[PDB]
Amino acid sequence: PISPIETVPVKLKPGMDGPKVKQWPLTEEKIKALVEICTEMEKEGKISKIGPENPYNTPVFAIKKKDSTKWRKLVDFRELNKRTQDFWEVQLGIPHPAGLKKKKSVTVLDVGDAYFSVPLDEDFRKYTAFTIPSINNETPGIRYQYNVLPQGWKGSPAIFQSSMTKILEPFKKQNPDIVIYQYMDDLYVGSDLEIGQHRTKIEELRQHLLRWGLTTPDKKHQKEPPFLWMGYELHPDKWTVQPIVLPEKDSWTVNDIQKLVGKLNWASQIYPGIKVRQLSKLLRGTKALTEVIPLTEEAELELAENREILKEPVHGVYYDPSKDLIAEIQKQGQGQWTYQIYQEPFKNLKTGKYARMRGAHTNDVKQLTEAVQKITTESIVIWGKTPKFKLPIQKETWETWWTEYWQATWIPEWEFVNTPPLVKLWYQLEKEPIVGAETFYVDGAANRETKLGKAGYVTNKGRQKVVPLTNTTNQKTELQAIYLALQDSGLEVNIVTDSQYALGIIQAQPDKSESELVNQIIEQLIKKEKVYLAWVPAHKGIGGNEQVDKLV
Amino acid sequence: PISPIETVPVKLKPGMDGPKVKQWPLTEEKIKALVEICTEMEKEGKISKIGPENPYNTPVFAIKKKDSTKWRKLVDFRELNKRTQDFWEVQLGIPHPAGLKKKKSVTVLDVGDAYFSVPLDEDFRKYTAFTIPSINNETPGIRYQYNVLPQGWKGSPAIFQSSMTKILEPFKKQNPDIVIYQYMDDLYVGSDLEIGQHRTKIEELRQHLLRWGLTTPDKKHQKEPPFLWMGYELHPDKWTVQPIVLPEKDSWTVNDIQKLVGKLNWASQIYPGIKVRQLSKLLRGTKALTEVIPLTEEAELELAENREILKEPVHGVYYDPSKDLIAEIQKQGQGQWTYQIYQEPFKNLKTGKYARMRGAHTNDVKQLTEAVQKITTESIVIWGKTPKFKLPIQKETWETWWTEYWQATWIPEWEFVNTPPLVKLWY
Numbered sequence: 001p002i003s004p005i006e007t008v009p010v011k012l013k014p015g016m017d018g019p020k021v022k023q024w025p026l027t028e029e030k031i032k033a034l035v036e037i038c039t040e041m042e043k044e045g046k047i048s049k050i051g052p053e054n055p056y057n058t059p060v061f062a063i064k065k066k067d068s069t070k071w072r073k074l075v076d077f078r079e080l081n082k083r084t085q086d087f088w089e090v091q092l093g094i095p096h097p098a099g100l101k102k103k104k105s106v107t108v109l110d111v112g113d114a115y116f117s118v119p120l121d122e123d124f125r126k127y128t129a130f131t132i133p134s135i136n137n138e139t140p141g142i143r144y145q146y147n148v149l150p151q152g153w154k155g156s157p158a159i160f161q162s163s164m165t166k167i168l169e170p171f172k173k174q175n176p177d178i179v180i181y182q183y184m185d186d187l188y189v190g191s192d193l194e195i196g197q198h199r200t201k202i203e204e205l206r207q208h209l210l211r212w213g214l215t216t217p218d219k220k221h222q223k224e225p226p227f228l229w230m231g232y233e234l235h236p237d238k239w240t241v242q243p244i245v246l247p248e249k250d251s252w253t254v255n256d257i258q259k260l261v262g263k264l265n266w267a268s269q270i271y272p273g274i275k276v277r278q279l280s281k282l283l284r285g286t287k288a289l290t291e292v293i294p295l296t297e298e299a300e301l302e303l304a305e306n307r308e309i310l311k312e313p314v315h316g317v318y319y320d321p322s323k324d325l326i327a328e329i330q331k332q333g334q335g336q337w338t339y340q341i342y343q344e345p346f347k348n349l350k351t352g353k354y355a356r357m358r359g360a361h362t363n364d365v366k367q368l369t370e371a372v373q374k375i376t377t378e379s380i381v382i383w384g385k386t387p388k389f390k391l392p393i394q395k396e397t398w399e400t401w402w403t404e405y406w407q408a409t410w411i412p413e414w415e416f417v418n419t420p421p422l423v424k425l426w427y428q429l430e431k432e433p434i435v436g437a438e439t440f441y442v443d444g445a446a447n448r449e450t451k452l453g454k455a456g457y458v459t460n461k462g463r464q465k466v467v468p469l470t471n472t473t474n475q476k477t478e479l480q481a482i483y484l485a486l487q488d489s490g491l492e493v494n495i496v497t498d499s500q501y502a503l504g505i506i507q508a509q510p511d512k513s514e515s516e517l518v519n520q521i522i523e524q525l526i527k528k529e530k531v532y533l534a535w536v537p538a539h540k541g542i543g544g545n546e547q548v549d550k551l552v
Numbered sequence: 553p554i555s556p557i558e559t560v561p562v563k564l565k566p567g568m569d570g571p572k573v574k575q576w577p578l579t580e581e582k583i584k585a586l587v588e589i590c591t592e593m594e595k596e597g598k599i600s601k602i603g604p605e606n607p608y609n610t611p612v613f614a615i616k617k618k619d620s621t622k623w624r625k626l627v628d629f630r631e632l633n634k635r636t637q638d639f640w641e642v643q644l645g646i647p648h649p650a651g652l653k654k655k656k657s658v659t660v661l662d663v664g665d666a667y668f669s670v671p672l673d674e675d676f677r678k679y680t681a682f683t684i685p686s687i688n689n690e691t692p693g694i695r696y697q698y699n700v701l702p703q704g705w706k707g708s709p710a711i712f713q714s715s716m717t718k719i720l721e722p723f724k725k726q727n728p729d730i731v732i733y734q735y736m737d738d739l740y741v742g743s744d745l746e747i748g749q750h751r752t753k754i755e756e757l758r759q760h761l762l763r764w765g766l767t768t769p770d771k772k773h774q775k776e777p778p779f780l781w782m783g784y785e786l787h788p789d790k791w792t793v794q795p796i797v798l799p800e801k802d803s804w805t806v807n808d809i810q811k812l813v814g815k816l817n818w819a820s821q822i823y824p825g826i827k828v829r830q831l832s833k834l835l836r837g838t839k840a841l842t843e844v845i846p847l848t849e850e851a852e853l854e855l856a857e858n859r860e861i862l863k864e865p866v867h868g869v870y871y872d873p874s875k876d877l878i879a880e881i882q883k884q885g886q887g888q889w890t891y892q893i894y895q896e897p898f899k900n901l902k903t904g905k906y907a908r909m910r911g912a913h914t915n916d917v918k919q920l921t922e923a924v925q926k927i928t929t930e931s932i933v934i935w936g937k938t939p940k941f942k943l944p945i946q947k948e949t950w951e952t953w954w955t956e957y958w959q960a961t962w963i964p965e966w967e968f969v970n971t972p973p974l975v976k977l978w979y
């Protein structure tokens with residue numbers, strides 16, 4: 001029940017000092033209950049009657065939930081915790097199955113009885129002092145002081161997993177075949193022995209632990225081959241997700257809409273095409289938890305296109321450090337990209353998606369890059385290496401673009417994989433003006449308050465126009481201006497603008513943006529033979545806005 | 553009394569609590585390096601294992617020593633620095649000689665090895681703790697913390713400063729014209745001797761340090777020259793102004809003069825005395841673009857005129873030691889990059905250009921990691937302090953690959969910028 005483990009010396013924050021809160025309501029039936037657990041506790045050395053002298057108290061509560069055959073002691077260390085130094089956080093993350101090695105037999109041990117076995121820094125004890133109120137006659141209550149890690153204390157999970165790891169270390173050495181992993185109240189053991197030999201090692205480990213005062217159990221209500229790990233359905237040579245539940249309903253609300261998406265994503269680790277752009281878009285309403293939201297058309301279709309997918313159970317394989325890691329990416333459309341990492345072209349290792357939630361204007365190639373990146377990170381975290389990539393884009397494309405782009409990117413090793421769609425450059429602005437082409441001097445202001453604007457051009461030819469627009473902005477007009485010139489120009493044109501805005505947006509060659517206007521522009525750009533853009537300062541350059549502005 | 557010293561009491565700024573920076577995850581290759589490298593330090597007593605009561609944590613990587621046989625443990629004490637050395641930039645500042653930039657040649661040696669003799673104040677250690685990660689979170693990190701002034705923490709130099717000067721002094725004597733600047737892990741020696749002498753004077757120094765405890769690895773090669781370039785040899789008396797070139801053209805076209813008007817147009821707030829109007833007047837017309845057109849009244853006058861106030865640097869361009877230095881970098885393509893190191897907008901303390909080579913061998917994220925270590929060092933020399941880089945790269949990409957070509961023992965401060973506009977044209 002208690003081990004001869006060295007203790008992690010502990011301290012209370014800088015200036016502070018132990019807590020002095022109390023609680024004194026005595027229900028006989030419980031003061032007994034506690035003094036009960038307490039006597040069987042002290043007996044087991046886990047606590048100690050303390051003589052009135054400097055102690056600091058803490059709340060004592062008695063509990064019995066459902067199926068109560070016994071009671072349960074419970075102290076509230078909230079006020080103590082708020083006074084103890086911080087510790088080294090562990091378990092921030094969980095190993096992800098897609099990178100687990102195929103092991104044969106397995107066994108999860110129960111180590112909850114745990115923290116009550118590890119010692120408490122001899123000196124930090126005085127603070128743990130709690131007091132069970134005895135005679136209501138306001139008599140010197142039977143007072144104790146913890147000797148092992150208290151159930152709620154701050155430094156407990158920490159000082160525990162610590163002590164643990166230290167106890168496994170030796171056993172881990174003389175048994176390099178026996179892989180262990182601990183997570184809180186548990187201690188999972190996986191090996192390549194046959195269920196017999198395996199239940200041997202388990203016994204040794206079991207004994208080993210016990211010598212260290214850490215007592216473990218032999219049976220309880222659990223299960224076998226599948227394993228229920230945090231959300232993963234774990235099988236000996238395959239893993240996959242515990243059956244998910246996409247609920248259908250009448251009125252949906254944010255709280256629900258979120259809980260849906262979240263469930264949806266989780267499935268993505270392995271369900272090939274899971275899509276989510278639409279169902280998420282419906283949460284622009286960054287507010288109401290109960291504000292019922294209409295599953296407006298676009299969403300529904302998606303959700304269902306997902307129901308058909310979960311509809312057919314699929315699982316995954318493990319990591320073979322011997323074989324190669326690969327990654328393929330396929331574009332889906334609305335800025336969504338799917339991928340799956342594997343070693344063998346058939347069943348998967350893990351899959352994933354990448355959506356561009358970065359605003360308004362983007363590019364397929366770029367996105368492709370962003371995807372790749374996302375994955376390389378994950379791969380490093382999971383496998384600790386960098387998959388060879390398989391991507392729907394040809395060097396004469398990629399290379400050309402990283403050659404143009406003002407930012408610097410860097411894709412790792414990649415092999416082209418011809419399969420629709422296909423990342424490419426739907427157009428290219430000409431670098432030098434066009435000899436012979438009509439020069440359109442576009443422009444177009446807007447009234448910031450009246451919201452009334454104009455957009456027009458004037459060509460070298462002396463071909464003019466102005467088109468009335470309402471409910472628009474300096475930006476909207478400025479583009480509409482570039483959309484106009486484009487419209488009214490021939491298969492070749494030299495366009496001149498004043499907005500660094502309009503310009504930039506066109507230069508990146510956005511494959512798309514839902515901003516139909518930009519699109520309208522984008523498409524005209526594709527239909528043209530040759531285009532040339534030019535930027536010239538606003539309030540003091542050319543001499544063409546004015547003659548149209550004076551009109552506006 | 554431990555053979556080398558007795559701890560120098562360290563105290564971080566009040567209201568300041570130790571670092572708690574997360575550990576980037578790494579490659580298995582890299583973990584194993586560190587795992588070995590640390591089991592060594594561990595043995596040599598250099599470092600120990602820590603418990604759960606050490607909530608502190610500074611990052612670590614593994615880099616290629618000098619494109620060598622084995623690895624190097626590179627700690628990113630960037631946080632612990634801000635939290636300490638800033639008041640050890642005071643309580644123990646290491647004075648920066650404004651003439652070294654003048655020397656004809658500056659060699660850079662790595663003294664990072666001496667520190668490991670000096671034991672770190674018994675109480676500050678807890679802060680220099682770092683953690684080697686694990687793949688797929690299967691195992692709790694490994695936790696080591698220092699016991700000797702560690703390399704990288706801008707506090708070792710300050711502590712060791714004492715003992716340095718002493719070791720140096722009897723060479724700074726026989727050699728009173730040579731300047732020796734200590735900056736963290738490295739020594740920067742300057743001299744106006746013909747190289748051949750210099751190089752020798754350096755090794756003449758290298759052995760002086762050596763026969764006095766300190767060990768400098770800087771032995772790049774021997775008699776056999778596999779076209780491998782000798783030690784770090786900068787030449788700061790050539791650290792002059794970069795070229796902002798307008799083009800003298802055979803023929804001028806609406807477009808050419810169009811753009812030209814732009815460049816000049818914004819140089820406007822670098823030098824508030826540039827006039828375009830005389831040029832901007834020939835474009836007030838809505839003429840074709842391929843069309844060729846000539847001068848205006850004082851056009852030619854204004855071209856060669858502003859061509860001038862341009863070749864003559866600015867004003868109010870003095871260095872503010874109280875402020876921070878800032879380096880902006882922009883891709884030029886085909887291996888070329890450019891940079892400015894200002895403190896406030898358009899008052900550039902300096903600018904330059906970096907260029908690697910041609911295709912087959914280099915990628916962007918190498919040029920940038922080098923253009924960076926280049927600009928850092930010019931900066932260390934000139935102002936005795938590294939700048940904060942406004943990098944034109946996607947945060948995560950950089951975050952992923954910078955180590956991949958990083959050779960410097962120190963790490964600057966950086967942030968990313970998704971927009972470098974009209975600036976590329978200009979420079």
Ligand SMILES: Cc1cc(C#N)cc(C)c1Oc1nc(Nc2ccc(C#N)cc2)nc(CO)c1Br
Pocket residue numbers: 095099100101102103106107108179180181188189190225226227228229234235236237238690
């Ligand atoms: C992640 C995990 C979960 C459970 C739990 N629960 C038990 C153990 C021991 C575990 O560790 C590992 N598991 C596996 N594969 C594994 C395969 C199938 C099944 C089943 N059924 C369980 C584990 N491989 C590695 C190697 O790296 C580790 Br480490």
Ligand SMILES: [Mg+2]
Pocket residue numbers: 443444498538545
């Ligand atoms: Mg205008």
